[PDB]
Design a protein around this ligand. Sequence first.
Ligand SMILES: O=c1[nH]cnc2c1ncn2[C@@H]1O[C@H](COP(=O)(O)O)[C@@H](O)[C@H]1O
Ligand SMILES: O=c1[nH]cnc2c1ncn2[C@@H]1O[C@H](COP(=O)(O)O)[C@@H](O)[C@H]1O
Ligand SMILES: *Cc1c(COP(=O)(O)OP(=O)(O)O)cnc(C)c1O
Ligand SMILES: *Cc1c(COP(=O)(O)OP(=O)(O)O)cnc(C)c1O
Lengths: 823, 823
Amino acid sequence: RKQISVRGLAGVENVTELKKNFNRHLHFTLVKDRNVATPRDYYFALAHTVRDHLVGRWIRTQQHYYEKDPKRIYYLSLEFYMGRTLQNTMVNLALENACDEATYQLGLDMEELEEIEEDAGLGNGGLGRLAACFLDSMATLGLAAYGYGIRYEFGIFNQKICGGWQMEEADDWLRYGNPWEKARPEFTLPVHFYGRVEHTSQGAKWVDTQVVLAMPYDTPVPGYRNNVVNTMRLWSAKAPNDFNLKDFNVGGYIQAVLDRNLAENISRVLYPEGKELRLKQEYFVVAATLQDIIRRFKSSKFGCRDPVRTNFDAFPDKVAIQLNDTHPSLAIPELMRVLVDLERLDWDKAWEVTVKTCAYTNHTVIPEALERWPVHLLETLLPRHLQIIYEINQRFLNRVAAAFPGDVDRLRRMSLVEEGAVKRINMAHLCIAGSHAVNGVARIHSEILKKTIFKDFYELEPHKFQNKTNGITPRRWLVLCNPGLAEIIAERIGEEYISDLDQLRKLLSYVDDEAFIRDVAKVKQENKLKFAAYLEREYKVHINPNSLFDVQVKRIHEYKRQLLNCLHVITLYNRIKKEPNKFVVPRTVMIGGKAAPGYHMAKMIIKLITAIGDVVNHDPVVGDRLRVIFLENYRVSLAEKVIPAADLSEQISTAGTEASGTGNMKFMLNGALTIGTMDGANVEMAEEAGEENFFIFGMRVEDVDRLDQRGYNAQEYYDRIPELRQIIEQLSSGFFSPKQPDLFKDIVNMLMHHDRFKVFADYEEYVKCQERVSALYKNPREWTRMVIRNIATSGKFSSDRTIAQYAREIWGVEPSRQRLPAP
Amino acid sequence: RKQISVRGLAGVENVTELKKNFNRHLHFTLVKDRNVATPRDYYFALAHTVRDHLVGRWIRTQQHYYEKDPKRIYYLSLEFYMGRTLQNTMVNLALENACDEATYQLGLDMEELEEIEEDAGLGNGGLGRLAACFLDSMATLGLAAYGYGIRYEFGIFNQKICGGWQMEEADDWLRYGNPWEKARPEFTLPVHFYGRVEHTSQGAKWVDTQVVLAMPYDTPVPGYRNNVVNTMRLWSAKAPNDFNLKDFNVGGYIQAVLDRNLAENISRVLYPEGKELRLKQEYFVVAATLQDIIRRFKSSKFGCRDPVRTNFDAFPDKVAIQLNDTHPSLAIPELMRVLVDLERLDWDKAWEVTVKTCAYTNHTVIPEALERWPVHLLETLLPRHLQIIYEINQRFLNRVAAAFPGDVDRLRRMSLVEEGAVKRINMAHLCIAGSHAVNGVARIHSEILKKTIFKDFYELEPHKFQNKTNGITPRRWLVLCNPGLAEIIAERIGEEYISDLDQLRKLLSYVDDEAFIRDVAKVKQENKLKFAAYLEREYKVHINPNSLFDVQVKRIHEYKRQLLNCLHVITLYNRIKKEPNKFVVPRTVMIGGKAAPGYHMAKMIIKLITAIGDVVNHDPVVGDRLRVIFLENYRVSLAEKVIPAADLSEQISTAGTEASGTGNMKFMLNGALTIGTMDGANVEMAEEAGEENFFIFGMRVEDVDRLDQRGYNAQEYYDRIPELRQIIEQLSSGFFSPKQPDLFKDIVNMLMHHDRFKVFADYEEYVKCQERVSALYKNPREWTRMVIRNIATSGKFSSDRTIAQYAREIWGVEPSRQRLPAP
Ligand SMILES: O=c1[nH]cnc2c1ncn2[C@@H]1O[C@H](COP(=O)(O)O)[C@@H](O)[C@H]1O
Ligand SMILES: O=c1[nH]cnc2c1ncn2[C@@H]1O[C@H](COP(=O)(O)O)[C@@H](O)[C@H]1O
Ligand SMILES: *Cc1c(COP(=O)(O)OP(=O)(O)O)cnc(C)c1O
Ligand SMILES: *Cc1c(COP(=O)(O)OP(=O)(O)O)cnc(C)c1O
């Protein structure tokens, strides 16, 4: 028994033991030989060779927490956007050098292999990426932490552009296996749906529930070189498969083959209204996670440390659930169902525990975005969960009246239940009620969570409102993707910045020196070259390495403002064609994102951006002064290529719409200069980088409210501005669409007659901020001089910080930059 | 490249490298650790320490085959009754001794761990088990063989007796994975169903077909210590999952959620009439194996060796295809299909090759049993294949006309098209026409196919019919299951017997040496002691390890006669209790079988065996002079546990019912006497042992044919024989059934008025033979000596013999027992 140990199984940094274990997984785990392997095989071979390294540590880390019994914190979220784990496993595990040398000797080129990896499809955007980043920084900072979510077979769509039209292909990233997960069919848990609550004697009973099974899969997450590796644990839905003869539902009728498939596809697709699948999904990931969380609390030596009921008294001293957005919110009536009905704690011992154990991050600014479910949808598949939502609610509103006696209209403003046609439940006031702390994601955004959106709750409990600004991981977003920039920096300062990012300000001391200043425009020359080849070898065009790489890689929504940017490039195209000879600083403009299937404005816009380009890029006069490029199927491993080769990071969202900008922080730290409105992220970045150092522009928040107060009359601008007048005119003539002139008709009328977001307002200012830009590119010494200052200044934008604060003010744990002994 | 070699990965019989490998797998593979591990988890680590050694050999053996280009033989069966891979994989590879040592130091019990493996639910009966025996033999004699079937996810049922009634439970054997297979997605092939045949220009084209996908799984098969490890490749059906958006069938309607369930379950269950499911499991394994077969032909250096068509002229000289019974029959219109339509050989060239490629093994006797598919089934799911079956049928019938000019009643009896209500196609006559050798499975059985069942095919082509008697492997069925018996036998004659079983004749030399005579009984005393301990510790009864373990482990049907051996147990009762103190040599009768859901007689026969024992085994007079046990859920792992432990092997079918009897042969080898009729396998086993050493009995066939010629009037026997009368009258009075007396009334009436298999007829002679049995037992020197002349005469029943004759007389290759150098 004790002879079964982790002890002899590694010669880690060793190009010869790593050549031994690559061979071991290709013939014995893959059961192939060099006579028939494929790149895919040899990548699988290599993913198990860096993985036994990771799971060597994993067992130690984990053992360590069970004998050291920290508070354990569960980050719950419905999207985890990991993307390729090979390079990140190696660079955080130290192993990249040994692996390169080893695969080299074995006559295999490790880069060609890292490009066989499928981006882990469990994310779709920001929110996903964000949790992805907090998992890194959590483990780097040694927290007893876990990420808990659904595993999505089909990701979410894979974008194809055919005809200058977006077609979504399916992403089955798992089609050939995933080398990093470990399934767990022994920890399968039941998840109950529908049914009836029979109230019997000392509780309520929820009976006749259908059931779907939650089957786990553990992917590990490695710290930065400290040998702590923690668990991400995604659930998968598996139907009961009695459905044959067993139960005697069937025999007579297998039409229940629909139980079978509707179940299995809880886990099949990410979402992408009030759907019984979304709510089915949300309940899924909460109900399994909470049985697991409770099980380590009964196990994790607290089986011994009972003193009370294996108490729930200690439950808040031992566990922390972070709800990410409102999709986790039933974590609160579900912990209240498990605690009350299953265990037996009275409602108030139970609710003490719940509030003290949860917390809720918010990411929305418009109230037309806070989740809301139909009470008839929660009565049908969740009936106990609606009674508890009602009893939480009663009790919360009795607290409210004992604070503001006689306010009546507040009792109807703060409720969980909302009345209209279709009485609904408000998922966010459920969360503020059942959390001990709420935090925004931007200072601007949590002030407006306090001041307007949740202000009566901010009066009733001011002390719940905190703020915790979002961040990026230094690792992925500078060391993995940007290694020259991480080399030259390091030369001049040290390593420690990658685990204490603000140290970057020491590079301020180098602002004039002509070393950094050429190096930086060197690396930056590197990056743009490589990628200016990727733009020919996988996808194709004729870039110009020299140019302004002008990129907005933003979700394609109206309010994100691609169309502002398409007028501007139609502006440049015009000038150069009237003035076939002006020295105009050239640009290669690169817009990238995925629409949303069935959002036809977004499908019309990616139509715009191709059609412009086919005009410009095939017109002689423009030659190679002006190229427009649509980056198909923008995603995390295209992020890490593009964001290093960029100069101009285009942040133009209407002001007030953005709650932040994580994608934003990522172009600061890789010396891209940020054009953009004074919103969300752009604010704290300008604060650090110095306003002078940032191309801030257009309508502030204020000015928009004012233009709304007097009413936005689009046409006026169209009639001052002679360029605009003409570009609208070229759009409606069919300049840019000769086969269907009429093609951009809707777009026209979008802008002219009912633009919700004031593109034509911010035009005139935009094209003059852009004039400042072209003008400063062509002064490389100073252009590059600013960049050094933006980079230097990036350290509040590191996720390690963001975590340190959830850690210190919300969770109650001191981080630790220590190295866990191990391997 | 070349440095990626199988070479440095194994210190084999090294208790220090096996423990190192256990530990890599518990931690690295399973991502478990000794705080969390379970006995299931440790068996998977042992499972894997061993598999590295297996697959090692498999890599060197398949390479070997591609560099020497042997004739590859493919065994086509829908049933492979493997049972348990681990004790068997260690013995073939010599590792049993080192793993015991190794796990013992780690302080884990290798017998504990072995008992957690699930019996590979890939079969059901003697057809499956033969195919497996053949597989161990084809590898032990250096045959370049491959076995091909379907992977059934649920097996066929698991048995469970509840109040003595059979309840079938499911067999999700695949539930915590199976660690011996390797799923190969990369090699998925489509299989086509339904459709319509477009007849265009140079060919017909099968168009508009539904497509199910066949994914392969490989399980390696080890020879006995000769280091050749061969392939079993079982197929899994998967639906194409575009079903969501892609095709534009879906969207508007997903009621084609059924294609998906009705595709998915070709691979779901084994069977268990004219069902589309069956013919769709039949074509599927055929469709998907003939492509992988024509792929190795085109690939395995015969690309090089084109000279003409990659001529399929050489196709017989390099492929051979064994259709085990009629379920692979479609391999004859599908090989012809591929070659005529896909390639473009003319009909006659293609038929030369199909006939020289295929060979049929038949296992039936009654003609009611020969497979038959209605032409409306074939016309619908297989409309090209119906066509080909018609040309084949026309043309064979024109051969027939030239041979028997003007014999018309022959033209109609030799047809593959059958005329009656429902026009059927006769899949047996298909097989004799496109195969180049038909064969029986025991000499009497070969002979009735030639004189009665296929005799006009015997007449037009006498060169085709062979015989190749069944055979059991000495490894599983003696070395593996009864190692004691192998050991005393080894002391005297060495090991060569295990790979050369005729050599057990040497044991005759020692019939009269008294060490052996006592070692043999000793051996057996152990086996029964062991077993008796199971019968209290996994199931419960009170054995008395001293009595005569009397056993029947046959399929529960009416011709298999357990009601005969029911009657006989009640006679022995009736006698111990009429005369409570006379001496009766005591027995523990054990009868086990699995009913077959839907057969009501079978189902009451086990209710019978289970209640006889309720009475006899609690009736205090009987003391321990009888006991009766229904063995729960007979499968290969209970066979290697009961078959060692027994004395008399109950082989009682009515004469003329049995073609052969794999069961039987395992009993002779493990020193058990065989009481039973002169049918099937009993014939040649009697002939090598001599009559004198067997307890043959009852109506011989020529007699059953007489009693039918005059008409078996049951009543007469019930009115001569008094003890018969007595038991019938016990059955109807409710002796055994006191709460519903009337319960065995349909058994009683069967017996009385319509037994097709003449129980009463053999009853009188039967119980007489049991008296000669008890008699001799009660004389341990001479009972042990008759036991030693059964074991010594075992030789003809070695599946290495049956294989060598297939190879030489049908497949056209030579056994070699040569060690491939390897590892
Ligand atoms: O009681 C324990 N003591 C030490 N290590 C443990 C114990 N329970 C679990 N582990 C380790 O913790 C990991 C995670 O366990 P889990 O929290 O139950 O998922 C396992 O892989 C083991 O390495
Ligand atoms: O052309 C070849 N040369 C050498 N080994 C081969 C070749 N093709 C296949 N193999 C080996 O044969 C194994 C089985 O391939 P299969 O028989 O094609 O299914 C592969 O896994 C390799 O070990
Ligand atoms: C960082 C990131 C993001 C985040 O994108 P942004 O914060 O810039 O804005 P939204 O698109 O509006 O959220 C999204 N996707 C990936 C791949 C990524 O790396
Ligand atoms: C050998 C065997 C069999 C086969 O049983 P029998 O050969 O006795 O004859 P039938 O009953 O007629 O098929 C079945 N099951 C197991 C486990 C086994 O080992």
